[PDB]
Amino acid sequence: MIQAYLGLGSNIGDRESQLNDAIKILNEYDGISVSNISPIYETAPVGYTEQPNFLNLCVEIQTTLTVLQLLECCLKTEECLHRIRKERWGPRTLDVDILLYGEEMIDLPKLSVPHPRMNERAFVLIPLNDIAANVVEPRSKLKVKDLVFVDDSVKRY
Numbered sequence: 001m002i003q004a005y006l007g008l009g010s011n012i013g014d015r016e017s018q019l020n021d022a023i024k025i026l027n028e029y030d031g032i033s034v035s036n037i038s039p040i041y042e043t044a045p046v047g048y049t050e051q052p053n054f055l056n057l058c059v060e061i062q063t064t065l066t067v068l069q070l071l072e073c074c075l076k077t078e079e080c081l082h083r084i085r086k087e088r089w090g091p092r093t094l095d096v097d098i099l100l101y102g103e104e105m106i107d108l109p110k111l112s113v114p115h116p117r118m119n120e121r122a123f124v125l126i127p128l129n130d131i132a133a134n135v136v137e138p139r140s141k142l143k144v145k146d147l148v149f150v151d152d153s154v155k156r157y
């Protein structure tokens with residue numbers, strides 16, 4: 001059993017309902033057990049043009065799947081929630097990202113863990129710190145509570 005952390009986001013449709021459905025579906029896979037769920041945050045989009053605000057949260061899982069098995073389950077969940085993949089990025093019903101997988105570091109074409117952008121993302125670290133404050137991010141070797149920073153664009157929903 002490995003403790004892993006997922007980052008979930010939604011910015012189109014009924015965001016809260018889609019996040020809750022996603023969690024339920026994730027927990028229904030064998031090999032994945034959801035053991036904790038952060039509060040939901042409303043967050044301003046980063047890395048792109050002006051876009052609808054996200055609802056974001058983090059989930060703790062206990063898993064017996066390999067990291068690529070886990071990735072398959074995360075992407076299947078997005079398909080369940082009808083995520084659209086157009087030529088250009090845009091709003092999404094659901095995004096399920098693998099943030100941490102034990103203290104492992106994986107660098108494959110299809111998979112990078114820890115997530116390559118998490119240490120500079122308040123929409124990850126704020127909810128992650130709610131459920132994983134003492135977990136070590138293995139590249140920095142810092143605990144999540146030592147990475148997290150104040151950011152007013154992330155607000156409790």
Ligand SMILES: Nc1ncnc2c1ncn2[C@@H]1O[C@H](COP(=O)(O)CP(=O)(O)OP(=O)(O)O)[C@@H](O)[C@H]1O
Pocket residue numbers: 071074075095096097098099109110111112113114115116117
């Ligand atoms: N840690 C990770 N979690 C999820 N997918 C990952 C991943 N590392 C690499 N990927 C790959 O990223 C591919 C594209 O996924 P998208 O969800 O479209 C990226 P995104 O989540 O919108 O951006 P982000 O990675 O900046 O958060 C997936 O098909 C998967 O192979």
Ligand SMILES: N#Cc1ccc(CSc2nc3c(=O)[nH]c(N)nc3[nH]2)c(F)c1
Pocket residue numbers: 008009010011043044045046047048051052054056089090091092095123
């Ligand atoms: N429409 C949209 C859209 C916005 C940003 C990116 C770039 S990645 C990304 N994901 C998140 C997330 O979940 N929350 C927040 N707040 N910002 C994020 N940026 C994108 F591809 C598409």
Ligand SMILES: [Mg+2]
Pocket residue numbers: 095096097
């Ligand atoms: Mg993703």
Ligand SMILES: [Mg+2]
Pocket residue numbers: 095097
């Ligand atoms: Mg993402």
Ligand code: NA
Pocket residue numbers: 026027028029030031032033034
């Ligand atoms: Na399960």
Ligand code: NA
Pocket residue numbers: 107108109112
């Ligand atoms: Na790589």
